Amino acid sequence: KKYIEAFSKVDKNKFYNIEDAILLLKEIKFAKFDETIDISINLNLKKNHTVRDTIVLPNQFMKPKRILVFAKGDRADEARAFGATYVGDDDLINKIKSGWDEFDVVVATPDMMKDVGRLGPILGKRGLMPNPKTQTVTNNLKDAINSLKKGRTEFRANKNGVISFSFGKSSMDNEKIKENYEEFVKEVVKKRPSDLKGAFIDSIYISSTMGPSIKVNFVWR
RNA sequence: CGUGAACCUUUACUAUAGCUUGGUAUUGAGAUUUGAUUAAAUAUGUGUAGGAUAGGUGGGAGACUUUGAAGCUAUCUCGUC
């Protein structure tokens, strides 16, 4: 009923901008609970091309994430000073192997990767193993913690050239949602492979928790 | 003997008349059908264990609810029945 009404109130042939689409979604928002609005981008993706990056959203609208630190020497103390939700050691590795999963993400130092290697069979189930590609493993443990606090998220491209990121929540302001979407679009464009000629992104739409997806006018300036 | 002729031969080289096949112009109206592609409608997707038909992605814990709920029955498309 509510979904039918929202679908009726959404126009598929209309090309509304980001703010207009956010306003329409908020008006058609029949989900009583605060809903995180996602963005689906169906762009030109190459067969052998991999699309993956990480971007810190301009506003932190996601719930707190348990940031764990795995480092030796002064690395654990530095993470604790930066505000690590959990600071661990080989004892932390043993706790994880026992089932220590009260945190949302795990970051490790280059040395702590020696113990984190045993975390492949444990962390690899959820994909939380430390890595340098996503900034989880690096010399800036404080930088990774700050990005996680700001709401850094990893974007990936599907096998059909599609991606589905989170731009915030319905309760978040229209300006905040627009800023997050613009930052994500700019990051995607900058990651757009130069080996492809034309439009890197074909279409972009925004869908709420239950609201029908609305495709915005894809204009790059 | 001459980087000379002529005619003749052929699975020597390169062309060509003739013959042949397709497109197009002369050259129109119809109908049926096999397609392909364009989108849109719409369904469909069962390793294993597992509550069971778990295709994938992410948002994702509330949503739907006389605009006919649970869910009874008949029946249809798929069925790995």
Task: Produce the secondary structure layout.
Elements: H1 2-9, H2 18-27, E1 38-42, E2 52-56, E3 67-70, H3 75-82, E4 86-88, H4 90-98, E5 105-108, H5 113-116, H6 120-123, H7 141-150, E6 152-156, E7 162-166, H8 174-190, E8 203-207, E9 214-216
Parallel strand pairs: 3-4, 3-5
Antiparallel strand pairs: 1-7, 1-8, 2-6, 8-9
Helix pairs in contact: 2-8, 3-7
The structure holds one RNA strand of 81 nucleotides.
PDB class: ribosome
Keywords: hibernating ribosome, bacterial, 70S, translation, ribosome
Entry title: The structure of a hibernating ribosome in the Lyme disease pathogen
Structural class: alpha/beta
- By DSSP (H or I, 4+ residues per run), the number of helices equals 8
How much of the sequence lies in strands comes to 15-25%
Strand ordering within the main sheet: 7-1-8-9
Helix and strand element order: HHEEEHEHEHHHEEHEE
Distance between the termini: 39 Å
Write structural notes for this entry.
This is part of a larger assembly, with one chain. The chain has 221 residues and is an alpha/beta fold. It contains 8 helices and 9 strands. The strands form 3 sheets. A 4-stranded antiparallel sheet has the order 7-1-8-9. A 3-stranded parallel sheet has the order 4-3-5. A two-stranded antiparallel sheet has the order 2-6. Helix 3 runs parallel beside helix 7. It starts with a helix and ends in a 5-residue tail after the last strand. It binds one RNA strand of 81 nucleotides through helix 1, strand 1 and strand 7. Binds directly to 23S rRNA. The L1 stalk is quite mobile in the ribosome, and is involved in E site tRNA release. Keywords: Repressor, Ribonucleoprotein, Ribosomal protein, RNA-binding, rRNA-binding, Translation regulation, tRNA-binding. Part of the 50S ribosomal subunit. It comes from Borreliella burgdorferi (strain ATCC 35210 / DSM 4680 / CIP 102532 / B31) (Borrelia burgdorferi).
